[PDB]
Protein backbone atom coordinates (compact mmCIF):
# COMPACT_ATOMS: atom_id res chain seq x y z
CA UNK A 1 0.00 0.00 0.00
CA UNK A 2 1.19 3.52 -0.85
CA UNK A 3 -1.71 5.86 -0.04
CA UNK A 4 -2.93 5.89 3.55
CA UNK A 5 -6.02 7.26 5.23
CA UNK A 6 -9.77 7.13 4.57
CA UNK A 7 -10.21 4.74 7.48
CA UNK A 8 -13.47 2.82 7.29
CA UNK A 9 -15.85 2.59 10.23
CA UNK A 10 -15.39 -1.18 10.58
CA UNK A 11 -11.71 -0.62 11.40
CA UNK A 12 -12.36 2.04 14.04
CA UNK A 13 -11.13 0.88 17.42
CA UNK A 14 -12.71 3.84 19.22
CA UNK A 15 -16.32 3.54 18.21
CA UNK A 16 -18.46 5.77 20.42
CA UNK A 17 -15.80 8.45 20.30
CA UNK A 18 -18.40 11.21 20.10
CA UNK A 19 -20.76 10.22 22.91
CA UNK A 20 -23.53 9.10 20.57
CA UNK A 21 -23.82 5.59 22.01
CA UNK A 22 -23.97 4.34 25.58
CA UNK A 23 -20.61 4.53 27.31
CA UNK A 24 -21.64 2.19 30.14
CA UNK A 25 -21.22 -1.58 30.38
CA UNK A 26 -24.30 -2.67 28.43
CA UNK A 27 -23.36 -0.30 25.61
CA UNK A 28 -19.68 -1.24 25.66
CA UNK A 29 -20.46 -4.96 25.45
CA UNK A 30 -22.83 -4.25 22.56
CA UNK A 31 -19.98 -2.66 20.58
CA UNK A 32 -17.40 -5.42 21.16
CA UNK A 33 -15.74 -4.66 24.49
CA UNK A 34 -15.16 -7.41 27.08
CA UNK A 35 -15.69 -10.04 24.38
CA UNK A 36 -13.72 -13.24 25.12
CA UNK A 37 -11.52 -11.48 27.65
CA UNK A 38 -11.22 -14.67 29.73
CA UNK A 39 -9.64 -16.44 26.76
CA UNK A 40 -7.16 -13.58 26.24
CA UNK A 41 -6.19 -13.76 29.91
CA UNK A 42 -5.83 -17.56 29.78
CA UNK A 43 -3.65 -17.50 26.67
CA UNK A 44 -0.83 -16.10 28.78
CA UNK A 45 1.45 -13.08 28.97
CA UNK A 46 3.78 -14.16 26.16
CA UNK A 47 0.91 -14.46 23.67
CA UNK A 48 -0.33 -10.94 24.47
CA UNK A 49 3.21 -9.59 24.21
CA UNK A 50 3.57 -11.35 20.86
CA UNK A 51 0.32 -9.84 19.62
CA UNK A 52 1.46 -6.36 20.64
CA UNK A 53 4.93 -6.89 19.12
CA UNK A 54 3.39 -8.21 15.90
CA UNK A 55 1.02 -5.25 15.64
CA UNK A 56 3.78 -2.65 15.38
CA UNK A 57 2.05 -0.60 18.05
CA UNK A 58 4.18 2.31 19.18
CA UNK A 59 3.51 4.29 22.32
CA UNK A 60 0.64 6.72 21.86
CA UNK A 61 1.92 8.94 24.68
CA UNK A 62 3.94 10.83 22.12
CA UNK A 63 7.41 9.37 22.11
CA UNK A 64 6.64 6.34 19.96
CA UNK A 65 8.54 3.69 21.87
CA UNK A 66 7.49 0.18 20.73
CA UNK A 67 4.75 -1.02 23.05
CA UNK A 68 5.47 -4.75 23.06
CA UNK A 69 9.20 -4.26 23.59
CA UNK A 70 8.33 -1.85 26.41
CA UNK A 71 5.88 -4.20 28.09
CA UNK A 72 8.24 -7.18 27.75
CA UNK A 73 10.57 -5.42 30.21
CA UNK A 74 8.11 -6.49 32.92
CA UNK A 75 7.96 -10.09 31.62
CA UNK A 76 10.24 -11.45 34.34
CA UNK A 77 9.77 -13.50 37.52
CA UNK A 78 8.89 -11.72 40.74
CA UNK A 79 11.48 -10.65 43.31
CA UNK A 80 9.06 -10.30 46.22
CA UNK A 81 7.80 -6.92 45.10
CA UNK A 82 4.37 -6.55 43.47
CA UNK A 83 4.09 -5.39 39.89
CA UNK A 84 1.91 -2.57 38.63
CA UNK A 85 0.40 -1.13 35.52
CA UNK A 86 0.13 2.64 35.71
CA UNK A 87 -2.10 4.17 33.06
CA UNK A 88 -1.02 7.67 32.05
CA UNK A 89 -4.15 9.80 31.77
CA UNK A 90 -2.90 13.33 32.43
CA UNK A 91 -2.78 14.74 28.86
CA UNK A 92 -1.66 18.26 29.61
CA UNK A 93 -0.38 18.89 26.11
CA UNK A 94 -1.89 21.98 24.44
CA UNK A 95 -3.70 20.80 21.34
CA UNK A 96 -4.43 17.35 22.76
CA UNK A 97 -7.83 16.13 24.00
CA UNK A 98 -7.91 12.51 22.81
CA UNK A 99 -7.47 10.74 26.17
CA UNK A 100 -10.33 12.82 27.56
CA UNK A 101 -12.55 11.31 24.89
CA UNK A 102 -11.32 7.76 25.51
CA UNK A 103 -11.85 7.99 29.29
CA UNK A 104 -15.14 9.82 28.96
CA UNK A 105 -16.84 7.92 26.13
CA UNK A 106 -15.13 4.50 26.00
CA UNK A 107 -14.17 3.84 29.62
CA UNK A 108 -14.66 0.07 29.56
CA UNK A 109 -12.23 -0.13 26.66
CA UNK A 110 -9.65 1.51 28.93
CA UNK A 111 -10.50 -0.83 31.82
CA UNK A 112 -10.31 -3.94 29.61
CA UNK A 113 -7.02 -2.58 28.32
CA UNK A 114 -5.83 -2.25 31.92
CA UNK A 115 -6.78 -5.89 32.50
CA UNK A 116 -5.12 -7.20 29.31
CA UNK A 117 -1.99 -5.07 29.66
CA UNK A 118 -1.55 -5.84 33.36
CA UNK A 119 -2.09 -9.50 32.56
CA UNK A 120 0.66 -9.40 29.93
CA UNK A 121 3.13 -7.94 32.44
CA UNK A 122 2.08 -9.82 35.57
CA UNK A 123 0.87 -6.61 37.19
CA UNK A 124 -1.09 -6.76 40.42
CA UNK A 125 -3.30 -3.72 39.86
CA UNK A 126 -3.72 -0.67 37.63
CA UNK A 127 -3.36 2.94 38.77
CA UNK A 128 -5.03 5.24 36.25
CA UNK A 129 -3.44 8.59 37.04
CA UNK A 130 -6.15 10.73 35.56
CA UNK A 131 -5.79 14.48 35.26
CA UNK A 132 -7.34 16.33 38.16
CA UNK A 133 -9.13 18.81 35.91
CA UNK A 134 -11.05 15.92 34.33
CA UNK A 135 -13.33 15.48 37.33
CA UNK A 136 -16.49 14.48 35.49
CA UNK A 137 -14.37 12.21 33.30
CA UNK A 138 -12.85 10.63 36.42
CA UNK A 139 -16.25 9.98 37.97
CA UNK A 140 -17.37 8.65 34.57
CA UNK A 141 -14.43 6.22 34.67
CA UNK A 142 -15.28 5.29 38.28
CA UNK A 143 -18.85 4.40 37.31
CA UNK A 144 -17.46 2.13 34.61
CA UNK A 145 -14.94 0.60 37.04
CA UNK A 146 -17.76 -0.11 39.49
CA UNK A 147 -19.73 -1.73 36.66
CA UNK A 148 -16.68 -3.87 35.85
CA UNK A 149 -16.18 -4.95 39.47
CA UNK A 150 -19.88 -5.76 39.87
CA UNK A 151 -19.91 -7.86 36.69
CA UNK A 152 -16.82 -9.81 37.77
CA UNK A 153 -14.85 -8.40 34.86
CA UNK A 154 -12.09 -7.10 37.15
CA UNK A 155 -11.16 -7.66 40.75
CA UNK A 156 -11.12 -11.06 42.40
CA UNK A 157 -11.12 -13.72 39.63
CA UNK A 158 -11.20 -11.20 36.79
CA UNK A 159 -13.45 -12.38 33.92
CA UNK A 160 -13.34 -15.92 35.33
CA UNK A 161 -9.65 -16.43 34.58
CA UNK A 162 -8.36 -16.82 38.13
CA UNK A 163 -6.15 -13.74 37.71
CA UNK A 164 -6.87 -11.11 40.35
CA UNK A 165 -6.58 -7.54 39.11
CA UNK A 166 -7.72 -4.29 40.70
CA UNK A 167 -8.06 -0.94 38.93
CA UNK A 168 -7.56 2.32 40.83
CA UNK A 169 -8.05 5.91 39.68
CA UNK A 170 -5.67 8.49 41.14
CA UNK A 171 -6.49 12.10 40.36
CA UNK A 172 -3.88 14.73 39.64
CA UNK A 173 -3.91 18.21 41.05
CA UNK A 174 -2.98 20.56 38.23
CA UNK A 175 0.56 19.87 37.08
CA UNK A 176 1.43 19.24 33.44
CA UNK A 177 4.73 17.63 34.44
CA UNK A 178 2.78 14.96 36.28
CA UNK A 179 2.11 13.29 32.91
CA UNK A 180 5.81 12.58 32.57
CA UNK A 181 6.11 8.99 33.68
CA UNK A 182 8.56 9.30 36.55
CA UNK A 183 7.00 12.56 37.75
CA UNK A 184 3.64 10.81 37.54
CA UNK A 185 5.03 7.90 39.58
CA UNK A 186 6.26 10.42 42.17
CA UNK A 187 2.87 12.16 42.12
CA UNK A 188 1.13 8.85 42.89
CA UNK A 189 3.55 8.40 45.82
CA UNK A 190 2.23 11.57 47.49
CA UNK A 191 5.20 13.76 46.60
CA UNK A 192 5.87 16.70 44.33
CA UNK A 193 5.65 15.70 40.70
CA UNK A 194 9.35 15.83 40.06
CA UNK A 195 10.74 13.42 37.46
CA UNK A 196 13.13 10.76 38.63
CA UNK A 197 16.31 10.25 36.70
CA UNK A 198 16.72 7.31 34.33
CA UNK A 199 18.04 4.66 35.06
CA UNK A 200 16.27 3.19 37.16
CA UNK A 201 13.55 2.73 34.62
CA UNK A 202 10.00 2.09 35.88
CA UNK A 203 10.25 -1.58 34.91
CA UNK A 204 13.00 -1.87 37.55
CA UNK A 205 12.03 0.77 40.15
CA UNK A 206 8.68 2.37 39.44
CA UNK A 207 5.69 3.20 41.60
CA UNK A 208 6.30 2.53 45.33
CA UNK A 209 9.63 0.93 44.35
CA UNK A 210 7.89 -1.82 42.39
CA UNK A 211 8.25 -2.93 38.77
CA UNK A 212 5.95 -0.65 36.80
CA UNK A 213 4.85 0.16 33.27
CA UNK A 214 3.58 3.66 32.61
CA UNK A 215 1.49 3.64 29.45
CA UNK A 216 -0.84 6.14 27.77
CA UNK A 217 -4.62 5.74 27.65
CA UNK A 218 -4.65 5.23 23.89
CA UNK A 219 -1.89 2.62 23.80
CA UNK A 220 -3.72 0.73 26.57
CA UNK A 221 -7.26 0.92 25.17
CA UNK A 222 -6.30 -0.38 21.73
CA UNK A 223 -4.70 -3.55 23.17
CA UNK A 224 -7.89 -5.66 23.62
CA UNK A 225 -8.82 -4.78 20.05
CA UNK A 226 -5.30 -5.78 19.00
CA UNK A 227 -5.58 -9.04 20.91
CA UNK A 228 -9.02 -9.81 19.48
CA UNK A 229 -8.58 -8.70 15.86
CA UNK A 230 -4.97 -9.87 15.75
CA UNK A 231 -1.67 -8.07 15.45
CA UNK A 232 -1.55 -8.56 11.68
CA UNK A 233 -4.78 -6.57 11.27
CA UNK A 234 -3.32 -3.65 13.22
CA UNK A 235 0.00 -3.88 11.37
CA UNK A 236 -1.94 -3.80 8.07
CA UNK A 237 -2.38 -0.03 8.58
CA UNK A 238 0.22 2.70 8.21
CA UNK A 239 3.75 2.39 6.92
CA UNK A 240 6.24 -0.13 8.25
CA UNK A 241 7.42 0.82 11.78
CA UNK A 242 4.43 3.22 11.67
CA UNK A 243 1.51 0.85 12.12
CA UNK A 244 -2.02 1.23 13.37
CA UNK A 245 -4.69 3.88 13.72
CA UNK A 246 -4.23 7.15 15.54
CA UNK A 247 -6.52 9.66 17.22
CA UNK A 248 -6.00 13.15 15.82
CA UNK A 249 -6.93 16.43 17.51
CA UNK A 250 -7.29 19.13 14.87
CA UNK A 251 -7.69 22.45 16.66
CA UNK A 252 -6.92 26.12 16.12
CA UNK A 253 -7.76 27.84 12.84
CA UNK A 254 -9.88 25.19 11.16
CA UNK A 255 -13.55 25.27 10.27
CA UNK A 256 -14.63 22.22 12.28
CA UNK A 257 -12.24 21.58 15.20
CA UNK A 258 -12.64 17.89 15.87
CA UNK A 259 -11.22 14.71 17.31
CA UNK A 260 -11.05 11.89 14.78
CA UNK A 261 -9.49 8.45 14.46
CA UNK A 262 -7.62 8.02 11.20
CA UNK A 263 -5.07 5.65 9.67
CA UNK A 264 -1.48 6.21 10.76
CA UNK A 265 0.39 7.52 7.71
CA UNK A 266 -2.43 9.79 6.49
CA UNK A 267 -1.34 13.09 4.89
CA UNK A 268 -1.78 16.24 6.92
CA UNK A 269 -3.64 18.01 4.10
CA UNK A 270 -6.03 15.08 3.70
CA UNK A 271 -6.75 15.05 7.44
CA UNK A 272 -7.42 18.79 7.68
CA UNK A 273 -9.44 19.04 4.48
CA UNK A 274 -11.47 15.89 5.17
CA UNK A 275 -12.23 15.75 8.88
CA UNK A 276 -11.84 19.38 9.97
CA UNK A 277 -13.52 21.17 7.07
CA UNK A 278 -10.20 22.65 5.98
CA UNK A 279 -8.31 25.71 7.14
CA UNK A 280 -10.32 28.90 7.70
CA UNK A 281 -9.87 30.97 4.56
CA UNK A 282 -8.86 28.00 2.42
CA UNK A 283 -5.60 26.13 2.10
CA UNK A 284 -3.93 29.30 0.84
CA UNK A 285 -4.69 30.89 4.21
CA UNK A 286 -2.41 28.34 5.90
CA UNK A 287 0.64 29.80 7.63
CA UNK A 288 2.02 26.95 9.72
CA UNK A 289 0.92 23.82 11.55
CA UNK A 290 2.12 22.63 14.92
CA UNK A 291 1.83 18.97 13.91
CA UNK A 292 1.46 16.99 17.09
CA UNK A 293 1.02 19.21 20.11
CA UNK A 294 2.98 22.00 21.70
CA UNK A 295 6.23 20.06 22.23
CA UNK A 296 6.77 19.40 18.54
CA UNK A 297 8.35 22.12 16.39
CA UNK A 298 6.07 23.74 13.86
CA UNK A 299 6.21 23.18 10.12
CA UNK A 300 5.46 25.95 7.59
CA UNK A 301 2.83 25.79 4.86
CA UNK A 302 5.24 24.41 2.24
CA UNK A 303 5.91 21.29 4.33
CA UNK A 304 2.21 20.71 5.11
CA UNK A 305 1.35 19.97 1.46
CA UNK A 306 3.00 16.54 1.25
CA UNK A 307 3.98 15.33 4.73
CA UNK A 308 2.40 12.22 6.27
CA UNK A 309 1.06 12.11 9.82
CA UNK A 310 3.19 9.34 11.33
CA UNK A 311 6.39 9.30 13.36
CA UNK A 312 9.06 8.84 10.70
CA UNK A 313 7.71 11.28 8.10
CA UNK A 314 7.47 14.01 10.70
CA UNK A 315 10.96 13.20 11.97
CA UNK A 316 12.11 13.64 8.36
CA UNK A 317 10.24 16.97 8.37
CA UNK A 318 12.52 17.87 11.36
CA UNK A 319 9.61 17.86 13.79
CA UNK A 320 7.90 15.01 15.63
CA UNK A 321 4.60 13.21 15.55
CA UNK A 322 4.05 13.59 19.28
CA UNK A 323 0.48 13.40 20.54
CA UNK A 324 -0.84 13.78 16.95
CA UNK A 325 -2.66 16.95 17.97
CA UNK A 326 -2.79 19.18 14.91
CA UNK A 327 -2.73 22.90 15.74
CA UNK A 328 -3.52 24.88 12.58
CA UNK A 329 -2.45 28.53 12.32
CA UNK A 330 -3.61 30.79 9.50
CA UNK A 331 -2.00 33.82 7.83
CA UNK A 332 -3.79 36.22 10.20
CA UNK A 333 -1.73 34.95 13.15
CA UNK A 334 1.07 36.68 14.99
CA UNK A 335 3.08 33.46 15.18
CA UNK A 336 5.66 34.98 17.54
CA UNK A 337 2.90 35.73 20.05
CA UNK A 338 1.62 32.15 19.79
CA UNK A 339 5.04 30.53 20.23
CA UNK A 340 5.85 32.92 23.08
CA UNK A 341 2.58 31.99 24.76
CA UNK A 342 3.62 28.38 24.27
CA UNK A 343 6.94 29.03 26.01
CA UNK A 344 5.02 30.91 28.72
CA UNK A 345 3.05 27.68 29.18
CA UNK A 346 6.30 25.76 29.43
CA UNK A 347 7.64 27.95 32.19
CA UNK A 348 4.37 27.85 34.10
CA UNK A 349 4.47 24.07 33.64
CA UNK A 350 7.99 23.22 34.78
CA UNK A 351 8.69 21.71 38.13
CA UNK A 352 11.97 23.50 38.85
CA UNK A 353 14.06 20.42 39.60
CA UNK A 354 17.06 20.65 37.33
CA UNK A 355 18.92 23.82 36.45
CA UNK A 356 18.60 23.98 32.60
CA UNK A 357 14.80 23.85 32.52
CA UNK A 358 14.22 25.89 35.72
CA UNK A 359 16.47 28.72 34.61
CA UNK A 360 16.62 28.53 30.83
CA UNK A 361 12.92 28.10 30.16
CA UNK A 362 12.21 31.29 32.10
CA UNK A 363 15.06 32.96 30.22
CA UNK A 364 13.68 31.77 26.88
CA UNK A 365 10.30 33.16 27.93
CA UNK A 366 11.85 36.55 28.67
CA UNK A 367 13.69 36.58 25.33
CA UNK A 368 10.52 35.48 23.47
CA UNK A 369 8.44 38.11 25.27
CA UNK A 370 10.93 40.66 23.98
CA UNK A 371 10.76 39.05 20.52
CA UNK A 372 6.99 39.57 20.35
CA UNK A 373 7.48 43.31 20.76
CA UNK A 374 10.75 43.14 18.84
CA UNK A 375 12.68 44.63 21.78
CA UNK A 376 15.91 42.99 20.71
CA UNK A 377 18.64 42.87 18.08
CA UNK A 378 19.18 40.06 15.54
CA UNK A 379 22.20 38.60 17.35
CA UNK A 380 19.73 37.50 20.02
CA UNK A 381 18.01 35.05 17.66
CA UNK A 382 21.24 33.05 17.50
CA UNK A 383 21.65 33.62 21.23
CA UNK A 384 18.20 32.09 21.82
CA UNK A 385 19.09 29.25 19.44
CA UNK A 386 22.15 28.41 21.52
CA UNK A 387 20.12 28.72 24.74
CA UNK A 388 17.61 26.23 23.32
CA UNK A 389 20.47 23.89 22.41
CA UNK A 390 21.86 24.18 25.93
CA UNK A 391 18.48 23.30 27.46
CA UNK A 392 17.87 20.46 25.00
CA UNK A 393 19.42 17.15 26.01
CA UNK A 394 20.81 18.45 29.31
CA UNK A 395 17.66 18.17 31.41
CA UNK A 396 16.20 15.33 33.47
CA UNK A 397 13.02 14.81 31.45
CA UNK A 398 11.86 15.93 28.02
CA UNK A 399 10.06 19.08 29.11
CA UNK A 400 13.34 20.89 28.56
CA UNK A 401 13.40 19.32 25.10
CA UNK A 402 9.72 20.18 24.68
CA UNK A 403 10.39 23.79 25.55
CA UNK A 404 13.49 24.15 23.40
CA UNK A 405 11.85 22.58 20.30
CA UNK A 406 9.14 25.19 19.42
CA UNK A 407 11.72 27.97 19.77
CA UNK A 408 13.95 26.07 17.36
CA UNK A 409 11.12 25.50 14.88
CA UNK A 410 10.05 29.15 15.08
CA UNK A 411 13.61 30.36 14.47
CA UNK A 412 14.22 27.80 11.71
CA UNK A 413 11.12 28.64 9.70
CA UNK A 414 10.45 32.29 10.60
CA UNK A 415 13.77 34.03 11.23
CA UNK A 416 12.97 36.77 8.59
CA UNK A 417 9.70 37.61 10.31
CA UNK A 418 11.44 37.87 13.70
CA UNK A 419 14.07 40.11 12.09
CA UNK A 420 11.52 42.45 10.52
CA UNK A 421 9.60 42.61 13.82
CA UNK A 422 12.78 43.73 15.58
CA UNK A 423 13.80 46.21 12.90
CA UNK A 424 10.43 47.94 12.87
CA UNK A 425 10.66 48.17 16.66
CA UNK A 426 14.14 49.64 16.22
CA UNK A 427 13.08 52.21 13.65
CA UNK A 428 9.88 53.41 15.33
CA UNK A 429 11.42 53.55 18.82
CA UNK A 430 14.64 55.36 17.85
Amino acid sequence: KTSFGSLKDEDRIFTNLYGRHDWRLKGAQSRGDWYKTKEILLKGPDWILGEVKTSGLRGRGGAGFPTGLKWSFMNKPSDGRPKYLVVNADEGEPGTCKDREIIRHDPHKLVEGCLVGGRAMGARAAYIYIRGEFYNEASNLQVAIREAYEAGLIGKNACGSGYDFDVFVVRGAGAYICGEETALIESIEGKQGKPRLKPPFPADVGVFGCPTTVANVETVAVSPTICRRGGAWFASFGRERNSGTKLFNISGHVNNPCTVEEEMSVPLKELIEKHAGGVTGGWDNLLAVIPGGSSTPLIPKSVCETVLMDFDALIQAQTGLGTAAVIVMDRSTDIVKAIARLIEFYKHESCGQCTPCREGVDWMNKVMARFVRGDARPAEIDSLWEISKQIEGHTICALGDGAAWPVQGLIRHFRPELEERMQRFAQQHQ
Binding site: G19, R20, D22, R124, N136, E137, S139, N140, Y149, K156
Partner: protein, 44 residues
Protein backbone atom coordinates in the same frame (compact mmCIF):
# COMPACT_ATOMS: atom_id res chain seq x y z
CA UNK B 1 -33.99 1.29 17.16
CA UNK B 2 -30.53 2.51 16.16
CA UNK B 3 -29.71 6.12 17.04
CA UNK B 4 -26.73 8.35 16.32
CA UNK B 5 -28.07 11.86 16.99
CA UNK B 6 -28.56 12.01 20.76
CA UNK B 7 -25.66 12.49 23.16
CA UNK B 8 -25.81 9.61 25.61
CA UNK B 9 -23.29 11.02 28.11
CA UNK B 10 -25.67 13.08 30.21
CA UNK B 11 -24.78 11.60 33.60
CA UNK B 12 -22.08 14.17 34.38
CA UNK B 13 -24.68 16.94 34.53
CA UNK B 14 -25.67 15.54 37.94
CA UNK B 15 -22.30 14.91 39.60
CA UNK B 16 -21.69 16.71 42.89
CA UNK B 17 -18.39 17.61 44.56
CA UNK B 18 -18.14 14.19 46.26
CA UNK B 19 -19.01 11.95 43.31
CA UNK B 20 -15.49 10.54 42.79
CA UNK B 21 -14.87 9.96 46.48
CA UNK B 22 -18.25 8.32 47.11
CA UNK B 23 -17.51 6.02 44.18
CA UNK B 24 -14.12 5.21 45.71
CA UNK B 25 -15.85 4.49 49.04
CA UNK B 26 -18.25 2.18 47.19
CA UNK B 27 -15.39 0.45 45.38
CA UNK B 28 -13.31 -0.08 48.54
CA UNK B 29 -15.19 -3.34 49.25
CA UNK B 30 -14.51 -4.90 45.83
CA UNK B 31 -10.73 -4.89 46.10
CA UNK B 32 -7.95 -7.25 47.07
CA UNK B 33 -5.86 -6.92 50.25
CA UNK B 34 -3.00 -4.52 49.55
CA UNK B 35 0.62 -5.69 49.61
CA UNK B 36 2.76 -4.79 52.60
CA UNK B 37 6.28 -3.41 52.72
CA UNK B 38 6.75 -4.98 56.17
CA UNK B 39 6.88 -1.61 57.94
CA UNK B 40 4.41 1.17 58.66
CA UNK B 41 6.36 3.90 56.84
CA UNK B 42 9.96 4.40 55.66
CA UNK B 43 10.50 6.41 58.86
CA UNK B 44 9.68 3.29 60.91
Amino acid sequence: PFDNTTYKNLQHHDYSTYTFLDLNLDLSKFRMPQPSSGRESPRH
